[PDB]
């Protein structure tokens, strides 16, 4: 494509009215208040590496009769912030991972009393070999996963 696969755009609903574009070439894409993060969002509540998105090769266990994803790539949203982010309706605690479907609205920080409302809209513009792009569908209906040493290592270099 042009260089971007996913677009995270801090929508007007959030105190930030900007648009972020995750270059399919960059994996994983880091977001936070630190310029070091591929994504730049200055939020007093946010952390240097509040959260980062990581793309992985999607592959089911088996393909009997029906032809599943086969073996393409998907984008996972990783959260490393202590303020925990919110993905649509699923909780994102420090060290969690979640599937990012085309049009994924992720809340980086939300304060009921502070009125601090944040949220980015994920928009897959380019599909760099995506089984679909981002429909997030499986036995589990939108579930939050945990992070491991592999993920922690990605941010370690950050």
């Amino acid at each position: 494509g042009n260089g971007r696969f996913l677009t995270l755009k801090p929508l007007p609903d959030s105190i930030i009215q900007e648009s972020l574009e995750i270059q399919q070439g960059v994996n994983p894409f880091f977001i936070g208040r630190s310029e070091d993060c591929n994504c730049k969002i200055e939020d007093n509540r946010l952390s240097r590496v509040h959260c980062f998105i990581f793309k992985k090769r999607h592959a089911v266990g088996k393909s009997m009769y029906e032809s599943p994803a086969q073996g393409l790539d998907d984008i996972w949203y990783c959260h490393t912030g202590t303020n925990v982010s919110y993905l649509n309706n699923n909780r994102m605690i420090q060290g969690t991972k979640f599937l990012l479907q085309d049009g994924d609205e992720i809340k980086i920080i939300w304060d009921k009393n502070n009125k601090f409302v944040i949220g980015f809209k994920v928009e897959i513009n380019d599909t760099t070999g995506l089984f679909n792009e981002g429909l997030g569908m499986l036995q589990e209906q939108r579930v939050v996963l945990k992070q491991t040493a592999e993920e922690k290592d990605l941010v370690k270099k950050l």
Partner: peptide
Amino acid sequence: EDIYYLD
């Protein structure tokens, strides 16, 4: 230190 949290 940096202590973040949201209730």
